[PDB]
Amino acid sequence: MSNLPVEPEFEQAYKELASTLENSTLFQKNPEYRKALAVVSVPERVIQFRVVWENDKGEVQVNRGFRVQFNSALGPYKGGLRFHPSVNLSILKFLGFEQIFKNALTGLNMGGGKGGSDFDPKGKSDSEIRRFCVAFMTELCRHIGADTDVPAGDIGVTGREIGYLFGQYRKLRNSWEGVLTGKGGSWGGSLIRPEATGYGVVYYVEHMIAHATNGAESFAGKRVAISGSGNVAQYAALKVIELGGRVVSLSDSQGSLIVKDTAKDSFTPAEIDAIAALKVDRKQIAELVTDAAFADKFTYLPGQRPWVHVGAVDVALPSATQNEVSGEEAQALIAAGCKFIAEGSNMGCTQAAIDAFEAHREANKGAAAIWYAPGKAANAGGVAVSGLEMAQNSARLSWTAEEVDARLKDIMKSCFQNGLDTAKEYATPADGILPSLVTGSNIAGFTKVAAAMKDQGDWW
Amino acid sequence: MSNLPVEPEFEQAYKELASTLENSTLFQKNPEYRKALAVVSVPERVIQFRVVWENDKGEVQVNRGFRVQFNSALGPYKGGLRFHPSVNLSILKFLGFEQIFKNALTGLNMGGGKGGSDFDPKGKSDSEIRRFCVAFMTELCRHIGADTDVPAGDIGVTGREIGYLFGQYRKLRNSWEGVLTGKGGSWGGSLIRPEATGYGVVYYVEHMIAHATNGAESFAGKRVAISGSGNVAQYAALKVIELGGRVVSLSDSQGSLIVKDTAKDSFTPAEIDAIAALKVDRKQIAELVTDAAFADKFTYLPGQRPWVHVGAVDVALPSATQNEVSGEEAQALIAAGCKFIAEGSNMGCTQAAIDAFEAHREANKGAAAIWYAPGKAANAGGVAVSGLEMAQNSARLSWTAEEVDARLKDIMKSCFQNGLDTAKEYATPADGILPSLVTGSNIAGFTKVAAAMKDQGDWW
Amino acid sequence: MSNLPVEPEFEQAYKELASTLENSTLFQKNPEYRKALAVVSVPERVIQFRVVWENDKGEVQVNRGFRVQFNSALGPYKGGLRFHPSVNLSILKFLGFEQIFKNALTGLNMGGGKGGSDFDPKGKSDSEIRRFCVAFMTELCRHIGADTDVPAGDIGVTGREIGYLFGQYRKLRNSWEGVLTGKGGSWGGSLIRPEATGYGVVYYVEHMIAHATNGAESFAGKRVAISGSGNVAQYAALKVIELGGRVVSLSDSQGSLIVKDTAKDSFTPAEIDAIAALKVDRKQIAELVTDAAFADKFTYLPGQRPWVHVGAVDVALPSATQNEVSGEEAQALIAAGCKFIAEGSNMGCTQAAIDAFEAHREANKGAAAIWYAPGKAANAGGVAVSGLEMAQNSARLSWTAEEVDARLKDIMKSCFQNGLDTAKEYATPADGILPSLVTGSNIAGFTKVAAAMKDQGDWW
Amino acid sequence: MSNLPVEPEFEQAYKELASTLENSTLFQKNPEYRKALAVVSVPERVIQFRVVWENDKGEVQVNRGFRVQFNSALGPYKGGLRFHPSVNLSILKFLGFEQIFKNALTGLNMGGGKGGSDFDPKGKSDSEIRRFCVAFMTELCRHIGADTDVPAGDIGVTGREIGYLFGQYRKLRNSWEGVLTGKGGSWGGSLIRPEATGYGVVYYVEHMIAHATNGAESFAGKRVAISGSGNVAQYAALKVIELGGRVVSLSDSQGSLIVKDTAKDSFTPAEIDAIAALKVDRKQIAELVTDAAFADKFTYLPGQRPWVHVGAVDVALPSATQNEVSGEEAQALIAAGCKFIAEGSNMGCTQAAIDAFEAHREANKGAAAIWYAPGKAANAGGVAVSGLEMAQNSARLSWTAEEVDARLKDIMKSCFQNGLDTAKEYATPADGILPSLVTGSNIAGFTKVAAAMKDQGDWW
């Protein structure tokens, strides 16, 4: 199999999944699942197309769009859309692969998929966004359907891009129906949908850590790091504040921001809202340390990640970008005595960091061990609300926020309980060394998907 | 624009909308909305086709069928169907335009549009109706869809025509689904649905007047006028009786029917039910004035309208046909002391009448002024119930009558408190000066549609 | 019947057809055909849509697109496309109605239809043309098909617009097929076509007049008037030069251009080539009269037509625009002793002129009478070549130019034979009195179409 | 563009095309064409899918299918299919890219595309072939159409695989039509075709050299090298024998097969037939060298190519595999006094070899210069008949072999002889110094495609 190209991110994710599976006795109990892994690892269908649009000057611009459809065993190809200049087939395959197991664990019936483009929304006027969206939905409308492929929003895709895409879809298909996720309330939208899109990952990470703390000596009184800024990180900080915790070293893509009094101070909600405003307007948080709000409060580090200089923290919430944690970051955290590491994104830690965390966890026979949480167990939320919006659009009736939040509570509890149950079945917990709940989540997702495919005849 | 033909009804409606918009400072606060007016004014798609059918003598008959799809920004092209010998493109365009704005003010997602035909259902046996319906749905099935266009019932289209049309649709598409509105209970029907439509229109008219009276000195005591007979007129009379009002001048198409004792007498529900029976039977109200009860209760005037010979009434409910209230009728009503004029139809008042009402409202400051209520704020109801029927059919699960009525209550309160709220808010009137309902309703409906189109990318 | 709008051009054409039919004894031999006229006169399907595009400044522009599918009894809805600011439903219905019988006479399959838009190609840059074409084909693609509707080129639609429309069609349908006529030779074009579009019309007019000259006293030596210019009049003059005739006066949109010496002078092909260059360049012929070669040979008239001052002419070829001949200009022609009037366009003469010509023809017992030829008998040729292009596209084999020209010669000869046959058969003249071409062509076209519809089951 | 993955073969082909374009004054005459290259280089649509099938043991195998649709400006996506264990996205993109320009030069209306799979037909029984074909056509059927995508045969795809694919296509679509190339005579096949593919490739590669001889000192008396065997190289040798040439180093994949007396002796026409027999039998050329007929005639070299040990040959026909000629082999040919070299495949020579040939060509002022021929003008030929297919299928009428050969003769003239004409016209030669036929063919193909895409509206 030497002909296949080199996709680093997807290869890393797949290798980690396979290693986690081989670690347990799953293949000793059910050796038939070895071929199910070989079938899942090949996407059902990927479509790459050329998008030719026009900028304001009247020149001709050629981008390319993608639509990866990894798996539709559990349900339709409902995925997302990511307009980022770094998007290629490798990262889209990685994100779809993670989507499969996130949707499996959450208990909802959805498939694993993800689309996007190399479009750079930074520095494009509204007209350019509309033109690219119209071209993109012209070249994509064949390969999606209301119950075939349902894209959504992500990095680079907001209400504006979603509106333009839906307008062109309605123009082309001549069929107003629910075929993408993110519409406004005026045209088949959902309540909680923007708040859920910006808050589901937050809810999941906070609740996941509160559950991993074993219900004693909770968030309160423990220093927390929130790498990255905007969408997830801001509300993650807000909820850890509401739970009695203190935001210590929230950062951005460009640089870091650490409170000088890391033990008797924190980022206030007003400051976090200020960063939210800055990130909506595409401004680095380094502008805030110029003002007296941060100048006497937070120290800006240029091109530094908070992990190395946390200052003896105990909770870490990496939510910036893939591979934002390495082995040396792990060493910094253990020197800091960090005992709860939980990603806020997908593959937020390097494989070396995972090995370091697992080794340290096995070293300490007790509650003093570090515990690592996968990104699949965390995050979620937004997928659930997208499914809820799909159900609303199919039923032609809009619900209220209370109903949607009740369904979200049920889904998140169900996901937590499914992970915990599979931890009981396969992670096989016992007092002493803490179990690897990463292994639990991986085993749960894989086994659910594999059984569903075996029933349907995708393998045998 | 010299090539553009002359459509008097649609031209009048559009002219009134534009004049109402320019009257307010809406185009001064958001001058960008001037182009949104140009985009809305053109229907998305108009389809005219030839319907060739056969009568009971084996003679070829040729009619025309239309399907105006005015706007689908807020949702699918759910409309209606009107089989009347006067249906041309102008009337259908005007009704579709009013549909767009009524659905905007409602808060439901449905889109504007309306179809029909030049078929004359009067004096055609059931065989002819079936043959025309089969030909009509043969030539229409391509353009409508299970979601694309969802027609409904209206003048000339009762349950019988709906049954025949749905039978032919099922035969052609070979897919039983919810594609048109008005189906019976046995197959994909809604509770009360046609009765619900008529009753909801009536509801809207009465409650709109009731809270245009500011909740003091209600229908009770104030004489009421109802022009026309059937559905809207008949139940308007019934509900104003239920509210303690006094029906005075129940009319029809050919002539009028006014109680002799306008003050100390009314219309009993039995006689109104008699009108209902004779109107379903294609009769005239002149037959009842021959009978003793009407002979001792009312006097018949031939080819006369109730307004000039009603007897100093305070509220009026035009519900017969468009342009049934001219300037001279306005003078008759103001001499009659009418202080609340509200139509139960579309453009029920001639332009001169609107000008007279607006002048009277402006000059006579205080609560002692006439108030003109738009037809868009009134009527409604039936659109909401049709949307409920569509939701039921999509979900494949029939609801209960109480559930449908509760959801209808919520929808009517939304739309209707919205009408009153926009009247007292977007008009932003002076104290004592009566909030112009027409201005508020027009502005609200427009602004909603315009924003929904702007985000979707129909203009910029 | 009062609800129908007023469409002057279509009404005039239909009235002329009906009056020609009632003139003969056709309805006495086959009174059954009286009900075929009612069915034919209603188009099968008319589709109007809104086209929203963007100009260079970045402003939203709104136009209307149309697609009249008048009849498909003989074959598919193959028609044309006319982008002109004067296009409305009436003119398109008239052109489709004439297309029906023109395609009937030619002996080929195609049906009668015609599309277009309110677009004004004058003064729009290349980018504007491309943007409008993309929007137009976005909103039109559903209604046409590879066989259903096959548009073509006409006034305002050149090879450029055809290229843009075909580029967008292939993008939407994702199927390269022959769905419109007029493409370049590289992507499934036709030989004997880019010039043949008007050259066929030219051939038809001149050969029709030559066959109306009864095989003596030919073109040579007879003054010819050719009103208008562009793609028809120019090559009509060229062919009448090849036949020995002398061009006398060719007009334009704004005025006329008449040679001083109507007897011993003519129009050289070089000057006509210059006219062609200016007309492609969207200039005016008023500017050439400054140049000496035109200054001492032609004179320019502002807002004047050649008819009333050519002087003692004998052949007339009105090929400028509809209704370009009146009764008074007809009387001017009779003052000139003209004995052969034949249109080069559709409805090139007013009804009053037709009455005058018919009266003059009936007055003179012999060969010394004026003869008026219908526009349906003339023109043609281009339709035949477009049908040949469709055949080539379906077969996926580009024929040689000689083969296409041979097939076109066969088709035109067959059409001439059918026209002359019906002129001598159903007009059925006496010796000396000429076989009226209008009656013959009208009767033949109507009879063929009616028989096809009767057999196919469009009327009983 | 750092995100764009590394595809060596396609990158090499694109770099060579761009370097050829920059070399001439194409971008000084038409600088607008610089932006067309950025648009052609991105495929219109690439589809990768998972093929899950079953072998004889009852296990589950997972392969990948592809379908690259590089361009559709000149015509539909008619391409090919190659089932080879080395097929990945890079190889398919490169082959489609070459297909675009080969179809451009051929004058026919065909698009650039190519599909295939990682399937290894070597060592799979008939049942395995059928099962994989059925799975492949199940997963591919929705992405192709009779006039959308038309695959064909290639390496690894023969009449058997084509039969199975067409059997499954008809079963799924339920519409017997011509949607792939290679069908047998009994079901919509073409005459000549099973020969015509390889036979036409041979025709091209050989008369391209025959016309590069300038019509003096022809094939006769000149040693010809033939790298590889099967389909093409065998008939290339056969007809160079027919033309009077002497095959001297006819080879295969694993090793070389060179006659001892490379000057006076030559390959037997029957000997090449024996090679064909064992290559269809899936054997090696070494086992023939074991037999006396080859033992006393040819020397077998294991893992060696003819080029280094040609023996002062003068004609080279590399037709084995991509990059089968390097710079050192080029220098061996120059030491051999080789003067005419033409590839029989796609990029039969490395870029270094191309530089060597170009330098040697420029060094010699006269007929002594070496001339290098592109694989686009050569090879091809079979594509002519492959497009001279599906036309009988759409017409439902088969043609006799003589008609197909006459059309093929016309196409080979208008492609190949006109390709030498293009080398004589746009390479803008002069007496003595040989022009660059590679440059001419590349520029002609690119300019044709670019103009077609420009008018279609793909760029501007």
From TrEMBL, chains A, B, C, D:
Keywords: NAD, NADP, Nucleotide-binding, Oxidoreductase. It catalyses: L-glutamate + NADP(+) + H2O = 2-oxoglutarate + NH4(+) + NADPH + H(+). Succinate binds at residues 78, 80, 99, 102, 114, 193, 386. GO terms for biological process: glutamate biosynthetic process. The active site is at 114 (proton donor). NADPH binds at residues 82, 84, 122, 154, 156, 193, 197, 229, 231-232, 253, 279, 284, 346. NAD(+) binds at residues 197, 231. GO terms for molecular function: glutamate dehydrogenase (NADP+) activity; nucleotide binding. SMART domains: ELFV_dehydrog. It holds the Pfam family ELFV_dehydrog_N. Residues 190-457 form the Glutamate/phenylalanine/leucine/valine/L-tryptophan dehydrogenase C-terminal domain. The record marks 154 as: Important for catalysis. Substrate binds at residues 78, 99, 102, 153, 386. InterPro entries: Aminoacid_DH-like_N_sf, Glu/Leu/Phe/Val/Trp_DH, Glu/Leu/Phe/Val/Trp_DH_C, Glu/Leu/Phe/Val/Trp_DH_dimer, Glu/Leu/Phe/Val_DH_AS, Glu_DH, Glu_Leu_Phe_Val_DH, NAD(P)-bd_dom_sf. One of its GO terms (cellular component) is cytosol. Belongs to the Glu/Leu/Phe/Val dehydrogenases family. Homohexamer. This is Glutamate dehydrogenase. It comes from Aspergillus terreus.
